[PDB]
Design a protein around this motif. Sequence first.
Motif, PDB file in Angstrom:
ATOM      1  N   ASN A   1       0.818  -1.210   0.000  1.00  4.50           N
ATOM      2  CA  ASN A   1       0.000   0.000   0.000  1.00  4.50           C
ATOM      3  C   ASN A   1       0.854   1.263   0.000  1.00  4.50           C
ATOM      4  O   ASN A   1       0.412   2.303  -0.501  1.00  4.50           O
ATOM      5  N   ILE A   2       2.066   1.198   0.556  1.00  2.49           N
ATOM      6  CA  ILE A   2       2.959   2.353   0.517  1.00  2.49           C
ATOM      7  C   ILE A   2       3.482   2.578  -0.897  1.00  2.49           C
ATOM      8  O   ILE A   2       3.362   3.675  -1.454  1.00  2.49           O
ATOM      9  N   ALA A   3       4.055   1.538  -1.505  1.00  3.15           N
ATOM     10  CA  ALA A   3       4.653   1.677  -2.826  1.00  3.15           C
ATOM     11  C   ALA A   3       3.623   1.772  -3.943  1.00  3.15           C
ATOM     12  O   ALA A   3       3.953   2.261  -5.028  1.00  3.15           O
ATOM     13  N   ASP A   4       2.388   1.328  -3.707  1.00  2.00           N
ATOM     14  CA  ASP A   4       1.385   1.255  -4.757  1.00  2.00           C
ATOM     15  C   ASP A   4       0.228   2.228  -4.563  1.00  2.00           C
ATOM     16  O   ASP A   4      -0.476   2.527  -5.535  1.00  2.00           O
ATOM     17  N   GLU A   5       0.038   2.767  -3.359  1.00  2.00           N
ATOM     18  CA  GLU A   5      -1.168   3.530  -3.067  1.00  2.00           C
ATOM     19  C   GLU A   5      -0.892   4.916  -2.492  1.00  2.00           C
ATOM     20  O   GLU A   5      -1.810   5.743  -2.480  1.00  2.00           O
ATOM     21  N   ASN A   6       0.351   5.214  -2.083  1.00  2.00           N
ATOM     22  CA  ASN A   6       0.713   6.386  -1.267  1.00  2.00           C
ATOM     23  C   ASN A   6      -0.137   6.453   0.000  1.00  2.00           C
ATOM     24  O   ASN A   6      -0.590   7.519   0.421  1.00  2.00           O
ATOM     25  N   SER A   7      -0.347   5.295   0.610  1.00  2.00           N
ATOM     26  CA  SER A   7      -1.143   5.123   1.813  1.00  2.00           C
ATOM     27  C   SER A   7      -0.323   4.350   2.839  1.00  2.00           C
ATOM     28  O   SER A   7       0.732   3.802   2.527  1.00  2.00           O
ATOM     29  N   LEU A   8      -0.824   4.292   4.070  1.00  2.00           N
ATOM     30  CA  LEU A   8      -0.145   3.553   5.125  1.00  2.00           C
ATOM     31  C   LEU A   8      -1.173   3.126   6.161  1.00  2.00           C
ATOM     32  O   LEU A   8      -2.283   3.663   6.222  1.00  2.00           O
ATOM     33  N   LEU A   9      -0.778   2.152   6.978  1.00  2.00           N
ATOM     34  CA  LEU A   9      -1.701   1.359   7.783  1.00  2.00           C
ATOM     35  C   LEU A   9      -1.483   1.632   9.263  1.00  2.00           C
ATOM     36  O   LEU A   9      -0.359   1.510   9.758  1.00  2.00           O
ATOM     37  N   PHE A  10      -2.563   1.959   9.968  1.00  2.00           N
ATOM     38  CA  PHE A  10      -2.550   2.171  11.407  1.00  2.00           C
ATOM     39  C   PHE A  10      -3.575   1.274  12.088  1.00  2.00           C
ATOM     40  O   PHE A  10      -4.556   0.842  11.480  1.00  2.00           O
TER      41      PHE A  10
ATOM     42  N   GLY B   1       2.433  16.286  10.091  1.00  2.00           N
ATOM     43  CA  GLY B   1       2.669  17.427   9.231  1.00  2.00           C
ATOM     44  C   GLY B   1       2.444  17.089   7.775  1.00  2.00           C
ATOM     45  O   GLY B   1       3.248  17.455   6.912  1.00  2.00           O
ATOM     46  N   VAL B   2       1.345  16.397   7.486  1.00  2.00           N
ATOM     47  CA  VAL B   2       1.078  15.891   6.144  1.00  2.00           C
ATOM     48  C   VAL B   2      -0.416  16.023   5.850  1.00  2.00           C
ATOM     49  O   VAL B   2      -1.259  15.732   6.704  1.00  2.00           O
ATOM     50  N   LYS B   3      -0.740  16.524   4.660  1.00  2.00           N
ATOM     51  CA  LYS B   3      -2.126  16.555   4.213  1.00  2.00           C
ATOM     52  C   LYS B   3      -2.573  15.143   3.859  1.00  2.00           C
ATOM     53  O   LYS B   3      -1.995  14.503   2.977  1.00  2.00           O
ATOM     54  N   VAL B   4      -3.596  14.656   4.550  1.00  2.00           N
ATOM     55  CA  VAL B   4      -4.112  13.307   4.354  1.00  2.00           C
ATOM     56  C   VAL B   4      -5.306  13.367   3.405  1.00  2.00           C
ATOM     57  O   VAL B   4      -6.193  14.220   3.548  1.00  2.00           O
ATOM     58  N   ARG B   5      -5.296  12.501   2.389  1.00  2.00           N
ATOM     59  CA  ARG B   5      -6.347  12.522   1.377  1.00  2.00           C
ATOM     60  C   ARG B   5      -7.625  11.873   1.893  1.00  2.00           C
ATOM     61  O   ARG B   5      -8.671  12.525   1.979  1.00  2.00           O
ATOM     62  N   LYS B   6      -7.565  10.590   2.245  1.00  2.20           N
ATOM     63  CA  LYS B   6      -8.751   9.896   2.731  1.00  2.20           C
ATOM     64  C   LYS B   6      -8.393   8.988   3.896  1.00  2.20           C
ATOM     65  O   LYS B   6      -7.226   8.671   4.135  1.00  2.20           O
ATOM     66  N   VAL B   7      -9.430   8.569   4.618  1.00  2.00           N
ATOM     67  CA  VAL B   7      -9.290   7.730   5.809  1.00  2.00           C
ATOM     68  C   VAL B   7     -10.299   6.587   5.690  1.00  2.00           C
ATOM     69  O   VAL B   7     -11.477   6.721   6.039  1.00  2.00           O
TER      70      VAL B   7
ATOM     71  N   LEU C   1      -2.493   9.502   2.082  1.00  2.00           N
ATOM     72  CA  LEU C   1      -1.986  10.861   2.125  1.00  2.00           C
ATOM     73  C   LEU C   1      -2.178  11.530   0.767  1.00  2.00           C
ATOM     74  O   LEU C   1      -2.673  10.930  -0.190  1.00  2.00           O
ATOM     75  N   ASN C   2      -1.768  12.790   0.676  1.00  2.00           N
ATOM     76  CA  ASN C   2      -1.918  13.543  -0.556  1.00  2.00           C
ATOM     77  C   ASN C   2      -0.834  13.123  -1.554  1.00  2.00           C
ATOM     78  O   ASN C   2       0.116  12.410  -1.219  1.00  2.00           O
ATOM     79  N   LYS C   3      -1.000  13.563  -2.806  1.00  2.00           N
ATOM     80  CA  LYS C   3      -0.024  13.274  -3.853  1.00  2.00           C
ATOM     81  C   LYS C   3       1.301  13.987  -3.599  1.00  2.00           C
ATOM     82  O   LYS C   3       2.361  13.491  -3.999  1.00  2.00           O
ATOM     83  N   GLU C   4       1.260  15.128  -2.901  1.00  2.00           N
ATOM     84  CA  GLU C   4       2.446  15.941  -2.657  1.00  2.00           C
ATOM     85  C   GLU C   4       3.442  15.277  -1.715  1.00  2.00           C
ATOM     86  O   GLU C   4       4.615  15.664  -1.704  1.00  2.00           O
ATOM     87  N   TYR C   5       3.009  14.296  -0.928  1.00  2.00           N
ATOM     88  CA  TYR C   5       3.855  13.639   0.060  1.00  2.00           C
ATOM     89  C   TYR C   5       3.953  12.158  -0.270  1.00  2.00           C
ATOM     90  O   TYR C   5       2.931  11.468  -0.346  1.00  2.00           O
ATOM     91  N   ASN C   6       5.174  11.672  -0.463  1.00  2.00           N
ATOM     92  CA  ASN C   6       5.387  10.239  -0.594  1.00  2.00           C
ATOM     93  C   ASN C   6       5.261   9.574   0.770  1.00  2.00           C
ATOM     94  O   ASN C   6       5.795  10.069   1.766  1.00  2.00           O
ATOM     95  N   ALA C   7       4.542   8.453   0.818  1.00  2.00           N
ATOM     96  CA  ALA C   7       4.434   7.702   2.062  1.00  2.00           C
ATOM     97  C   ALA C   7       5.710   6.934   2.379  1.00  2.00           C
ATOM     98  O   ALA C   7       5.921   6.560   3.537  1.00  2.00           O
ATOM     99  N   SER C   8       6.564   6.701   1.379  1.00  2.00           N
ATOM    100  CA  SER C   8       7.801   5.966   1.619  1.00  2.00           C
ATOM    101  C   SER C   8       8.845   6.833   2.310  1.00  2.00           C
ATOM    102  O   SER C   8       9.589   6.339   3.164  1.00  2.00           O
ATOM    103  N   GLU C   9       8.918   8.119   1.964  1.00  2.00           N
ATOM    104  CA  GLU C   9       9.854   9.013   2.632  1.00  2.00           C
ATOM    105  C   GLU C   9       9.377   9.418   4.020  1.00  2.00           C
ATOM    106  O   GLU C   9      10.190   9.868   4.833  1.00  2.00           O
TER     107      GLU C   9
END
Lengths: 74, 90, 92, 124
Positions: free
Chosen positions: C26-35, C55-61, C77-85
């Motif tokens: 989901n990180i490399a394919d979706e720009n998302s992450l799991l909590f 400190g990141v604009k989150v797209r959806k939850v 998260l948003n397109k502007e922020y990579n979830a991998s970095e």
Amino acid sequence: RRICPFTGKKSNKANRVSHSNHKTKRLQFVNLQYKRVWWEAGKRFVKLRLSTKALKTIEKNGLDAVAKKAGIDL
Amino acid sequence: DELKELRTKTNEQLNEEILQLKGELFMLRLQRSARENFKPSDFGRMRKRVARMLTVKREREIEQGVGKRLSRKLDKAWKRSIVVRPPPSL
Amino acid sequence: LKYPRRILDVYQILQSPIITEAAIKNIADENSLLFTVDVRADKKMIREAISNFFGVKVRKVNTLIRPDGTKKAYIMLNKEYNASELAKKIGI
Amino acid sequence: RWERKDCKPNSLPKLHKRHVKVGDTVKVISGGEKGKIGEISKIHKHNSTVIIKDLNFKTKHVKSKEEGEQGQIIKIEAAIHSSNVMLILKEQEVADRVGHKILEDVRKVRYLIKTGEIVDTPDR
RNA sequence: GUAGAGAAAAUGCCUCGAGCCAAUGUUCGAGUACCAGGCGCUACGGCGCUGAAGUAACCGAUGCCAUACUCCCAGGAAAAGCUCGAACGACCUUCAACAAAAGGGUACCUGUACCCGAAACCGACACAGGUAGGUAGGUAGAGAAUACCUAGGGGCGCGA
RNA sequence: AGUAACGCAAACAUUGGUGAGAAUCCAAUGCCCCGAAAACCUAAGGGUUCCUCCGCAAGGUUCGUCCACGGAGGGUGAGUCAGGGCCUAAGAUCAGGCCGAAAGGCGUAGUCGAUGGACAACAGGUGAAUAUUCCUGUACUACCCCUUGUUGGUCCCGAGG
RNA sequence: GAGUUGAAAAUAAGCAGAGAUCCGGAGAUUCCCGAAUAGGUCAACCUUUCGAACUUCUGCUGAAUCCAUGGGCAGGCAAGAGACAACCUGGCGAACUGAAACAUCUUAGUAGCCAGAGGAAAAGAAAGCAAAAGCGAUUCCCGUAGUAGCGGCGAGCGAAAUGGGAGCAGCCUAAACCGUGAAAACGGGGUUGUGGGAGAGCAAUACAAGCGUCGUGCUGCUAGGCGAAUCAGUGGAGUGCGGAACCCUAGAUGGUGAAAGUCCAGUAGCCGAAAGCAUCACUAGCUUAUGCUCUGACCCGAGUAGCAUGGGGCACGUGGAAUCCCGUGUGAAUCAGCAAGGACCACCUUGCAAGGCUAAAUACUCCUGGGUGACCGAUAGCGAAGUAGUACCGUGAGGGA
């Protein structure tokens, strides 16, 4: 309930007896009948559910001391 | 190890230190999930220290003189507005 | 006054990330992450607790319940922020 | 083994009061390994048992690795009961009972009841 | 439009409007998609590149028009959303409230797996039984019966 | 008594593979069965049976390397789909009110109560387990900001529907 | 005073001889459901104007109705709701059974159901028993006594008085009378019985006792502390056996390889409380208050007693049926009286109903802390020595290893 609020008259658990001494229950209860009696401290009728002994009090003794004896008037 | 400084600090820095220790506790949860080398004892005395902080704050609620339900309405009246802020350790 | 639906101890509204291989998918394919969050949580309380502590604009939850009781939250998260970095900084 | 687990009043285990501290020189009184001195190593308050050094010999067999290699035979001590030991001063070699002298300061120290010295060790 | 105590409505009167209604339909969405095939390796389980035609007519629905008409008596729910509006009644008032026209922003909880003409549900069973609803291919046939089959799924958990 | 039975008379057979061990697990080829289903999806119910790996103590009316079984880990993503944040029917609970040894019975306003009324998303792909939910395309709802006008507006009330 | 982060090992990090873990007193938190209480709810959830909802109290405004009432708004650490094994009280209240049937009766005012409430509850301070002699509130035990009785005089039911013990404790209120107010009230007085009180007048002062936030007092409890006295030989181990010594204000108990006065924890005894609770003893203080004479007038609890009926319950089943309490209806007297003394009348004796409150002796165990057991030892003892009201069965009540 079948109670009078002025004088605490309740029903009477009193069996009835036939000629062959058979006894059923026959819960025996008072003639606390609907009336609407005049009230001198307001000059107006109140609707009450009065036993006839309590009727004889509120005509003999007056409604004020009987209603304050019970505690309620309104 | 006596925590004598907590009865010296005023209520604002008390409450701000509560929020900072809770944020550091969440960082210890992230570092526990990350399997980086962490101290579980700090995870103990973090929450265990916030217990000290809220006992001192609640004693300060006592010596003014107010009800338990007034402390419920005051505490929950404060908890509704807490903007999340990361700790100053960066 | 602006009340939330429930006052739920906002510094404990998030519990732990998920370190499975599908989370890295989901990180490399979706720009998302799991909590992993508690059951008493929102798409309004978690979404505010990401744009503040990180400190990141989150797209959806996208939230879901898990039958062992606890709640799982896919945050995108948003397109502007990579979830991998932003996930290597935490330890993913 | 539920017949031998620890009894728990209000979720905490009932710990016994005993007479042996760590760093003491005990003698085995009667059972088995009778009449030999020794330090104690690790303490077990719930059983009222004490493991003491280099006397009790329990040759145990341990599957060592997960690859099935070298399988070592380790000779490990076991727990002798705390009532089977006494204390020893190295000046008068005699096994003696205990006693609690209250000295001039506030502290209360151990005492061999037949000789005249103190079991209690300072901070080092 | 008026008329009556008459804002809307209802009723009564007057006037203007030959059209109206809805499935279907053309275009955009919509092709640098999908797709037969060939092209290169197999952990031989599939991935990689390229890609033609993508129309017409006959049948014909139990689906839409459609609460469309006709007939009958046994005469066929309620409230909110929605629309219109005077008096009376409660609150707030100017960059506040209301109505739109393009353009951006924001997106509340629970259910979501799997079985569901059943080995997982109900019959104590991995039980020749039961379980509301939806999709209804070809041929022969009036047909959802029947006989054989495409898709898809099995060979019924003792055999010789 | 090592007796009846092994749960329809759709039907399997062979070659390979895995293993210590194969009629039974897997793969291929034929054969055969249902096909208004013995197919696919959803309501209820069940509650983890779903998926990978490992195991064959017990269960599978035989065996078993397999499993709806045992162990570890994972999996259920919605503004638009279905319910609640809207509405009411049958019915329930009923403030006051009447009644009644007690418990409670009757009953109005009110409030719950879907099997109904109202309200906005479809196609392709991804994928060991999720798809109107995730990605991409085009949309549509409900509020705010940005521009024109208005001084009144909202609710209750009156009506159509 | 020495190691700890429960069972429960291991691992990672701590916390601790400026005293950890643990124990005890007082506090703090106590998500959600459940009286559940902001509203709904299909309990542990949803929606939220984040609210102790409702009843009660207080305060303001105060409808039809002038005062009212109802309503609305507000305050309030805010009184009640809910739970509780058994005993207790109040109400509804059986039937199988016994009578060798069965209806009167019994079982039985028991079980059950509902409501309430406390560690006890009820009752309780003579309109009482008794008999010419006397006692002095209530409760409980032994007794009379299985007596007198009652009863299809069947089955059965069954007192009471005299006597002996446990425990003792008695007090407030209405009326007559004065004072304030339209009553209704309020403040003084008075509450007793071989009669008092009110009215009028005369005297007279302090002995004794009751109640009690408040804090010094005492013991007790909730943590604990010191605490006597032996080795050696024996086939795994000695506490047993055999040899040598001792303690005892301690030889109760449990454990320790095996049975212990001398091994441990302990015990006898001596000590010990910052804090809370309890026991009686102080305390600022409030209170109880006295005697005589005259006076039949005024008062001593009214829809009450009694009576005619219908009954219930006292052991007493309607019987000569008294005492006690109710249903309908009638309906008194104040002390020169009224009620009781087993129909009733006369005399005497006893007491003063129609107003309330009280500790003790007393009954029981969901329990708690000590001590016991001719009680059990895994088919027993609690259903339950592990997940026990569990797995499992039932839709559920419930059953249940």
